[PDB]
Symmetry: D2
Subunit: 212 residues, 4 copies
């Protein structure tokens, strides 16, 4: 399971993600609302460009199926996940306009740039390995801090996490992993793109915690 | 009404499409099944690259909304048209394997090449005007020869046409026109792409009629 | 520097198409000096669009070469196409009484547009060695056309037709084809995997000639 | 024209570049050689990927003459520059092999990601706006600190700086400014690319000065 190896080598960085202040405070309920709003504003850009990345990926899939895979997921992002992002802005008192006018921070610009760049120039499975840390990490975060939600008194925060605990989102991650494993490529010639995304995620959280 | 102008200038071509032997025979019921099978083989792979084309388009839309459209106009081709076709193959006695192994003819390769090329290097709205004749022309064909379906004794043929008579497909063609009509650009600065696509549409039908 | 392997297989499988190219009247008549000047003039006008888009194709190829040396190679071919080859192209036009402006304004025919579309599409979305398989027929076929009809130039009375053909006979041009052969031959990709790209371009080459011979 | 506006709006970030210690110390001859050596190692990745960016730009130039400019620049980066870079590495006891094996830092990867992404998906004049800060800033860095080279005792440091002082290098900048100024596009709608690049340049100097 090549995907498993990618995860093992990444552990060092991932373990620092899973134990990150922002994530811990969010699930517990201690995260200040201003940190959570700032993070929500930054997520618009994350989300749009991630849709683009998946489109680029889908545009050059070896098979039809693998295209459908990336295209439905690309579609899921600007309608499915999007509507959920809007309901979370409203709860907090923000809008799509605010988010659209929200200025992306450094890690945001760089990470999105990295994904798009990668999905426009590299091999499909290689662009998939770059997109894996996003879906998977959020899953495992929910798996580790999912228990703290019971005591969490902020409704918005509990509604945010719920997605990642859902068997529809987990089921999503199960398929993406299954794809990279079924390709027929060595894990060492796939890590560079998995690693960089992992480190970026770890840099993403930190920027929302600092608020810069 | 820019889209309307594009259609007017194109009339010379389109009129030759709408009155094409392949199309007329199909709706009437006179089309030989071997011509229809050949045409079905060339199409499932035409629709695959059409999906890719729309993904490429989606990947670089000026706004988020326009990304949604192109991506829904994309995924919508995957659900609506592609699913119909996978059923059409079974009824006729062919498979997706046969189709996947089916060798694309000259017009097919060129027309697909033209769309992908266009959607990878040109402006969004300009790629959209290249993609319009595909959706629209099939609608207007159904509008002209829709009536002959009643007397058509070939079930597979009636099932093929049905999609293009549907208000879900008509609605799909409206969005594109709205995109192009609300864009800002002129018909003159949008026609060369609309003309090229329309010209390939006539040539693709003819390639279908002859078997090469 | 040199070849042996996959590129030869592609040539063998493409022999059917390629033999139809090598024996094509346009080419036969050009080297012989029989070709009507109007047809040559048409061909030169259609060359602008071919040349320019081929440069784009090479630029997309360069943008995703597996190595830096392979990038350098792709990049140097692109630059050349718009510098040295343009130089020769503009020079051919002047001799025939045409200008670059004429070429720029010339309306590319269907084969031209479709073929450039295929090369650009292929090079913007496929792998590097697969983009090279699409770009090889162009370089190599011209070399083999020259090798075949080269002897006829001795009796060819049309200077411009000889000047044009000279490039493809030169040791520099033949050497270039061999470097591209080397690049693909060292790729380690199979022929069966690479064929579709070599094929389609080979077919466009046959049609690009025929389109020039017909006048559209 | 428009390029001058971009420069004025970017003056805040650009003045922080122009006064940056690394640069100050380099032209002065104060810069520790280890820092210079680090910077040279990081340049390989800068140089290679900037060539890719210029190739992507070329692939979609609105005119043929603009295509020639991108290509010659791209070819220049990989022919003339490279020769000079290798010659600069040899004087410092380093080799191209060393550079190739050097691990690009975060700013480096993120910056090259941004240019490649921008150049593989955005408009041509927008790509040029992303690539302009690189050329122009080095010209203005040299214009600022050029006087200090007279007393600078480190040969390699002077050899490096000479390029940016040369009339050929300035003429190139003027041509690139020309290309933009005459594009008919707005400074306001061309700034978000010229801005981010300017910020990455500032982050590139500072990373080299810190060695990490």
């Amino acid at each position: 399971g090549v995907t498993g190896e990618l995860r093992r080598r990444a552990d060092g960085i991932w373990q620092r993600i899973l134990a990150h202040p922002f994530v811990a405070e969010l699930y517990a309920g201690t995260l200040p609302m201003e940190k959570f709003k700032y993070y929500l504003l930054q997520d618009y850009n994350y989300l749009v460009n991630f849709a683009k990345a998946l489109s680029l990926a889908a545009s050059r899939a070896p098979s039809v199926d693998l295209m459908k895979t990336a295209l439905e997921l690309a579609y899921g992002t600007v309608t499915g996940e999007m509507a959920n992002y809007e309901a979370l802005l409203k709860e907090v008192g923000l809008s799509l306009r605010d988010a659209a006018e929200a200025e992306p921070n450094r890690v945001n610009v760089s990470y999105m740039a990295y994904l798009k760049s990668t999905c426009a120039l590299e091999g499909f499975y290689q662009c998939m390995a770059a997109l894996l840390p996003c879906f998977w990490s959020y899953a495992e975060i929910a798996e580790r801090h999912g228990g703290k939600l019971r005591e969490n008194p902020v409704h918005v925060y509990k509604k945010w996490a719920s997605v990642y605990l859902s068997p529809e989102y987990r089921g999503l991650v199960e398929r993406l992993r299954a794809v990279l494993d079924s390709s027929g490529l060595s894990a060492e010639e796939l890590w560079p793109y998995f690693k960089e995304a992992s480190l970026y995620e770890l840099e993403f959280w930190q920027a929302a915690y600092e608020g810069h």
